[PDB]
Amino acid sequence: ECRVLSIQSHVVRGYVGNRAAMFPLQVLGFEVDAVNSVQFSNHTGYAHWKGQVLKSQELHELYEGLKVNDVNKYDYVLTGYTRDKSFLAMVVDIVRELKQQNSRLVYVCDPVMGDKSMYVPQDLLPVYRDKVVPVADIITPNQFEAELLSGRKIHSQEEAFEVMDMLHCMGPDTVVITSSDLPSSQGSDYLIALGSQRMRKPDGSTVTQRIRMEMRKVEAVFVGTGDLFAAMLLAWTHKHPDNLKVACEKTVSAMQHVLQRTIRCAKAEAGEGQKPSPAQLELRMVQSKRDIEDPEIVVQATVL
Amino acid sequence: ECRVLSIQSHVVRGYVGNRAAMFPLQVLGFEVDAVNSVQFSNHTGYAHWKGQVLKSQELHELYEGLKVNDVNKYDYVLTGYTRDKSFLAMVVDIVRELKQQNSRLVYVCDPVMGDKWNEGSMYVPQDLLPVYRDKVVPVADIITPNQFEAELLSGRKIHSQEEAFEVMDMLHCMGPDTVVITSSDLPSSQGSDYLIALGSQRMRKPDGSTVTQRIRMEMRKVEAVFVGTGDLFAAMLLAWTHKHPDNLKVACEKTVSAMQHVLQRTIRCAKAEAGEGQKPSPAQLELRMVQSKRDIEDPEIVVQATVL
User: Fold this and answer.
1) Angstrom distance (rounded) from CA B135 to CA A200
2) Segment (H or E) for A166
3) Per DSSP, what are the bridge partners of residue A211?
4) B92-101 core/surface letters (b: 16 or more CB in 10 A; e: else)
5) Testing the interface with A: which of B8, B62, B293 to mutate, by most A Cβ within 10 A?
6) Which residue range(s) make up the domain with A184?
7) B196 neighbors B187 (Cβ within 8 angstroms)
8) What is the rounded CA–CA span in Å between residue A105 and residue A184?
9) DSSP secondary structure code for residue B68 in this structure
10) Catalytic residue among B75, B84, B141, B231
11) Coil, helix or strand for A281?
């Protein structure tokens, strides 16, 4: 009923990019057309990796193959980590063409650039700032990426929501900072996540619903969390288009279930007191199917 | 707990090869490592298709990346459509190495070569028949050929159920302990609208002797061309024989019922998209797999096999 075009990485083993996004979206009832931007044996956190990268021209070929068969029709577009400027520009062209075809198409974009250090070529920051974010409808940056895109440092929740207002102005009606260094009432081990949604009333007036979320931190390095998060947020905002509170509660709860099961099974696979390897920390995606289909609400968002 | 190495095609839209095999396997509780042997916009049944094919050396590089990380560990290997002799030979090398590392590894192979025109025709290079005969099938444990492929591999033509099972015995001799002829020209008890499928499994006895369990099944024929059916069938047969290792009857009943549910829903939705009385396009005939999730998880048994 609802078709998503996901243009992301593919790994033979593991869950990142499309591997982390297609399965959940599929179990949540979405048809998914997947462009594997790369094919690697595993993600680059392993000691070794081998694979091939799809060229931008090759991406264009695949899109034109869908187009000439008149099956380039989508309700959503979903993207995440990209290392090549050409590739991201081609993605923006595809998004613009699709939105010209369907004005109600929702572009969900994780503007992957950095964290805490920027681990993407610097020439992509302008592209994300001036080309990608403007045509995005839902963006899931972390705090550092929100600062990069806005140009302003965030020292407070008030400043964070001012930056999120700037990002709203740049395009997306829904902005979720998924991770931040903001202090939490609950403790130092809770991370703060913020949500802002511009809701257009029939009055013609627009009101900004703002929400606060705090989640217990899992102290382990996971790969693909942003991709899973953006995919499930796509799903749950689709089901709750004017209730970002519930959409984010469900997304964060499913994430918590997935990460809890993953760390449990990783510690089991490794020895007690032993640090799980990157191979052992792969998101236990299939085993969380049920939790992804209907997540038990384990986090409550606070309306501001 | 169970990891399958699936080396098959990937399509951006649709369900063939890995697209048709990963999702059911994943939904049935299997971990899947997928080598996309190609990335096409869609399957070759469409009017057009664009993309790239993975080179045999590239397959080697990916497998070596898994190996050097010591994650070349698999309980199953699953393959289907391959058009390159070198790619198939590399698959055979990989399977041999894995079976040296794991003697219990189960190689599920759909020896895709051709089918029938109500006379037979191959849709793969002829150079693949020897490789499938002398290299692939000998290291396979479960093969799901149609009647045409069984005849090609055995060198005998099948004219009766008796001859079909003699050919399946020859295929057993060649290697695989489980042989399912998914499609056949054999006459059905219900008429021409039902198709015949056969199953044969060599069971090692507690005495050490070997006995062959044989089964017959009839399915309603669906009047439409579907792509990826063989891949979905091989995947779900892998899953259900893993659950039912010594009961080919129940495994095949579940697999064929899931196929029937998926195909029924697909043809219904395809006729809905198209007009009443209008032939559905290949794009409209894509297996409605997501919408069939639950039927794949626990299919309603709508077909019953007869043990011979």
Assistant:
1) 65
2) helix A157-170
3) A195, A303
4) bebbeebbee
5) B62
6) 1-304
7) yes
8) 36
9) H
10) B231
11) coil
